[PDB]
Symmetry: C3
Subunit: 555 residues, 3 copies
Amino acid sequence: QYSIEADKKFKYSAKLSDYPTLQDAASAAVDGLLIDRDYNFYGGETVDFGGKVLTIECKAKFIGDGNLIFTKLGKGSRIAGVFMESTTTPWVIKPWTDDNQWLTDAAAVVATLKQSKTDGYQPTVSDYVKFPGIETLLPPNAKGQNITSTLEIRECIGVEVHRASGLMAGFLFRGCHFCKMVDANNPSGGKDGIITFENLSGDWGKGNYVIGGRTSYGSVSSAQFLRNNGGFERDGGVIGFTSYRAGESGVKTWQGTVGSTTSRNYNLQFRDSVVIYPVWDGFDLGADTDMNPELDRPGDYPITQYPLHQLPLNHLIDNLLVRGALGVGFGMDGKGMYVSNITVEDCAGSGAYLLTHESVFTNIAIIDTNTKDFQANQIYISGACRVNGLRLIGIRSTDGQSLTIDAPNSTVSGITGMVDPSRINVANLAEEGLGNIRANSFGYDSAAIKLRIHKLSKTLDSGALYSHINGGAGSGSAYTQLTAISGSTPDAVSLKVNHKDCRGAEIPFVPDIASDDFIKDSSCFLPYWENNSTSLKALVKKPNGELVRLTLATL
Amino acid sequence: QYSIEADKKFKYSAKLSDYPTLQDAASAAVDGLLIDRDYNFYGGETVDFGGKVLTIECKAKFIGDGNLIFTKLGKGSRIAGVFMESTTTPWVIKPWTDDNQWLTDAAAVVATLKQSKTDGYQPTVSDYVKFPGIETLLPPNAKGQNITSTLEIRECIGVEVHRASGLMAGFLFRGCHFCKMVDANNPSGGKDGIITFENLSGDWGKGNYVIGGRTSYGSVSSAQFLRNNGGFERDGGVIGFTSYRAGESGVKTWQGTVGSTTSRNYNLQFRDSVVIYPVWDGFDLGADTDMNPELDRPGDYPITQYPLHQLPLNHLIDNLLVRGALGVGFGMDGKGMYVSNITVEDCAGSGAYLLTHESVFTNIAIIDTNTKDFQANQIYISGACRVNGLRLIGIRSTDGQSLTIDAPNSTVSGITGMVDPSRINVANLAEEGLGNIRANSFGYDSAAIKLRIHKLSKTLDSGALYSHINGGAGSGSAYTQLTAISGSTPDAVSLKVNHKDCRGAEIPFVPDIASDDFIKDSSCFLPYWENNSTSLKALVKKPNGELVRLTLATL
Amino acid sequence: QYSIEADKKFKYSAKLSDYPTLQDAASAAVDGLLIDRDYNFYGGETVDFGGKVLTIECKAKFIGDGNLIFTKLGKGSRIAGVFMESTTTPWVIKPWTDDNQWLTDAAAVVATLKQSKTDGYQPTVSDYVKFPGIETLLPPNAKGQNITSTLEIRECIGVEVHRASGLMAGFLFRGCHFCKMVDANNPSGGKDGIITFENLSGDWGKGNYVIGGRTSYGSVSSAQFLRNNGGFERDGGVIGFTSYRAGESGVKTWQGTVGSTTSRNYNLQFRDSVVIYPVWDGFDLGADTDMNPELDRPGDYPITQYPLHQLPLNHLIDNLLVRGALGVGFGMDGKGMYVSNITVEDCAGSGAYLLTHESVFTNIAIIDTNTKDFQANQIYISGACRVNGLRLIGIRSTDGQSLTIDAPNSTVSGITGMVDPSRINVANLAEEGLGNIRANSFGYDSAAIKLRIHKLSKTLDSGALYSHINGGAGSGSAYTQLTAISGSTPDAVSLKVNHKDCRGAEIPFVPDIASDDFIKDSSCFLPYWENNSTSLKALVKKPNGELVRLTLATL
Ligand SMILES: [Ca+2]
């Protein structure tokens, strides 16, 4: 019988073109399921896949506003090529120019309004803060919109969504474990987060990843996590991902209470990823609320155990790039954190906002940030942290008085760049382990090794060692100078060696009668001027510590 | 009826073993298409896939010289495992030894000639420049060869080629958008570029990527782009890729006019990638022609708007590694660029050749490059740029007079390595933001903090602060010395503190009668020698600025 | 005839549910093979796939202790979703606490014993060394266990295993070439290595990679190689991989003789990867045995050609992260190596153990390692190497006398961090290419530029340049001080400029009659005390080099 042989030798796949509803096709499926016609779904339409391990291959669109809900997929199920699209074409704003300059003026942003499923985003309430005054100026038809076409995977284990795309599209994993969003094929976002792992009910989320791929646009954050804990195994997070033009942030771990419980996250990886042109932040990896925080943490550690911003979040954070944020490039909180290899460039707000304590930051580069003076500084650290390697300043100038680094409880080593030293505030700055040193000077007739005591003055060097050309180039002659500040005049007092190639030391003397207390150490002398005789005298502290006054030079 | 049920329950796939031509199989296909026998194609053979969204699975070879042309594939089509192979076995050169040393002598290169589809490449005209004299020495049968077996995807949107391989193989996307070359499985290249996105006609290319994978050999560049613009979204470029032994360069964005229009590229990503042993360059990301440039840019911005090498290319460039180039490791041009985290090692030409202006380079490492003295320097920057963090020198020495960095308009901070300071040329070099410092000296009886004024001398230190051992190790005693250059003799003039553990300052004096102009500042004195009385005198500039001469020390 | 049309239009797949043995299903398969029921295999069960190019899709478990052996798969075959599981539930140890602190006490480790297929590992003989005393304390039923369920690919070319997982699971490629383990889906390991490329027989392994994915647990190493050589093309190794909690090491290239031949490896890539919480080492990339080494290298280069630890291994090593090792973070040997961009944090043994010679290390960060004092240092280098950029110290203190870096034959530049300078030992340390410098001091009333001659003292600075506040903050006045050590008392002897805002130089003098030899240079004077007359004298070395004694200051 051919049918016996056929049933044994051919691959099983059901296809949607043979069925009137998606549930009918799902029920028929045994191995493969092919989406080979566009399918209009109603919001909340729910498909039961019977616990089957299905390979779902999409070659057409799921069309609808609201959520298409997939349930009871077997472990190992895979959904490839899915394409979500809204039925509604909403009003979107586009707060950047044709030369990719951010628009900050509310009226200019309102002028960008158009009806489109892409190239912009639907305003939300956070836009009222981001573009002050815009709430009053937006037409009512552009406020409070709620358009997203969302694929919801509900309460499944071991399901992977690969190469997803769409228009006004979102992807929600609700109450899932060991699920992955892999190689997202640049979906264009809607009102809700583009990729969400939300585990507010049931067990803490674990094994949930965004791996590879990219997203564009969306009103809020591109990739986000609520109530996930990767365990000590660090089994979850974001690796190899790119976010472009998030309406809020590129990658976000939620903070505070959502509903009746914690939305926070522990033990996730954030590695090898890039966020470009977010309207708010590149990476927002905080767990506690900054402004107007909850007095408790239902479902999480109490404030009595860990103070605000001091949770043992224990994320693995490495090799991240942010460029072009209108908000903050990289933000986090927590205690006992290690963070490495972070690069932030060209952000309008702070490059880094770090509400961290007893944490270590290694090889950080913050290059041309706070370019619009939105924050007090380019990098802020609240608690007692360590920074080992910090690159500051690209090519931008700073006209006002804002600090570059304000990390008042932190100890820092290894700053590089053309930082204005008056714009550094740290607890301690040191290079303990340098070798033999050479200061090489270009474009000047001198070289300098300067000292600045910030307690005395943040703006004036307190002393210096200089080398200065005698005559011109090629003269083979220079003079060395040791200086000290007096009367807030840098270099006011100095000793010289070889000025005008004289081969001698020029020694400063006290310009009047020296007081007893002017001399510091025993077996030393201090020259001073006696004008009434045209003589140099010496105040001498003898080897035995007693003072005597001698005549040093006479007419 | 079984046939009704069978048509509903089984996956559709056509296979080439059932058809006499590839077009017949393509026409029959509805979902899958299996290449299950080797297929000999003629150059220019064109397959029309009818707009169908096909999953093409290759388990055999496409064999032929020239192009196999795929057209009218539906968005979402995928081609996996394709294997291209030429019919011709050409003559190839192998310009490296069994110890992986580059051959540079033309006669030695000619001696490597063999007929093979791999382990070398077909000479092209660029080899005549790379190996001077080789044009005369190559036998005629090894010149002007043109063997490539090329899969051409023509005027398609949303097509992905995955896990491709081959021998004398190339992959061309001509007039395509939103197409990807994913996880290339080490094809061995032919005469043409291995992976090309060419958009000289139609709309500018966008959404075109090389993601993952690797290539080997080829006569010209491994991955290349013509007339692509990723948009502000940076939707295209090269991520996660490895090139080995390109006959020209690993990754190339074309420069200048090709045909009648621009071949240039904007807004692409070049990230997380590696180029090893290219015959020419690792990354060639320039857009304007260097030698003998066009006087115009048909199809692009005019020279009147942006001068040569000053286009707003706006690529996203980060986390690149190059090793073993016979040419330049990393090259680019453009204005307003940000570049980060570039590592270049062991190149025979310059590590970096940067025809850039108003651009920022952060965390650059150029380690043992220009090892064959092909260029004037290891890193060159033409325009007014900023470098923040620059590692120079591995373990190689430099016998001649070539510069290490020549960046005469650039401001630089954060050099590390055993650079010869005479081989640094920059506009300005500074460490503005160091903390308290310690110079730790090993393998010497002294420690040093030296100063060098490059305007005075690039080769001689102009002054120093030294600490020198008194006696031997463990003596608990050292002397401190402040020095200045005179008569081109470093350290010619000095003041000492604690020489021979004497607990005193040794002060240099003018060895003859001091001229009036030798003293600089008021309320200072300058000792000088009066030989005719065996006396020290003091030239004194009094507190009121007037000069007087006093007797300082007498018999 | 429908059967003719059906045979042409449907995809071929055989499925295990239709057959009594795996061999029966394999024999029936032509294109696809679906594993759609759990399959109990016996150890050594061998399947012959007839040279067919098969796409094997797994949606169920292979269950058994021992090896399931796949042979004669055609080039291009793929195995997806495989899940290996043992029949035995062994006794496992879990040497870490509920706060993720390592357990080091043998009795505490024994107390963790449980029967499970995961969340720990089976003890092996290396545990007897790691937890001293544990050999005596372990119950007999927890010693010498040998449970692994291993998929063995034997003597195949061009086979890829994708998205594999399991419990007590291993994956062995024995005598294979051009094979890949791709996107491992966190298999939980057993007694043997989780991913092994072993080529002890036949040709040296080539083209063998681990790409992407992750593993957890296992008694020994996560990914390992024996007798592989990637060629100059670097065609093999580990890229994009994560290892968690290896019972030995994350990534290992074997050392020494195994059986009758070499187990060593050449020309592999180790890039873009992460190892966390290994019981032994993060990356172990050595080739020669350290303790009690072989006197020969059968099958490899003789000791007469390359001494122990000086093989030309030529691996491409870049962009690696290790955190939380109980052993060493990063270890290797070899001569002529280049290594870049390595980050190691929070390891109980050395961050790096480098038995390397004539090798270059660029941009290395070793942050809070040797935290349990297991080794003599945080980073060790035996041979004559170069280090360009080395970050040391996070937030941990060191109570004892151990060194931070011991690299006694190496030349180093670019240390950053709060290193204790007495804990640096190198051949030479230098910053040759710094610009104009500023020392910025926070939290002190002074700024300092110190000098330390390690030959004199590793613990005491030998001289200094200080700037000190006169009075208080905002006074606009400081004094500069130049000091030298005497009698092992830092700063014992000093010259001051502007002490107490006096505008003069305080000059130290010899406290008794100066000996002739106390003066160094011609045309200099040295003041000294004559107590019997209350006078300063000057020992003068005249311009002609002859000595004279003069009266300098008198009552
Ligand atoms: Ca006198």
